[PDB]
Amino acid sequence: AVVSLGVFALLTKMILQTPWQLSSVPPTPDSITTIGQHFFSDFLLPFELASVLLLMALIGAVVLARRE
């Protein structure tokens, strides 16, 4: 309880103190086509490695929860 309250107070002070850069320009409405552009231009390594992540997770979970 005390560590949670202290960490929350610390984070709240950090959030209320730092001067974020608001950059007042309206966002984009077509937010899915942009995510589609970032999967294969910028975030290609993570998009490709998430497949192997899912495969290894499936393998290991079937092995751990198997019945024998």
Partner: protein, 54 residues
Amino acid sequence: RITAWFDRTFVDGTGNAFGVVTLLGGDRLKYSTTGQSQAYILTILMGIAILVIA
């Protein structure tokens, strides 16, 4: 009979105490690994909010 006794008690002992202490400091500090994962997460959370203070 004094000197030998001194050597057998004060000098030798003074050289052994260190060792003995270093044994105790290990025998009664293993209990910091309490075996409770929630305690480990408490120590990880005490790491933060303290280095953040220092």
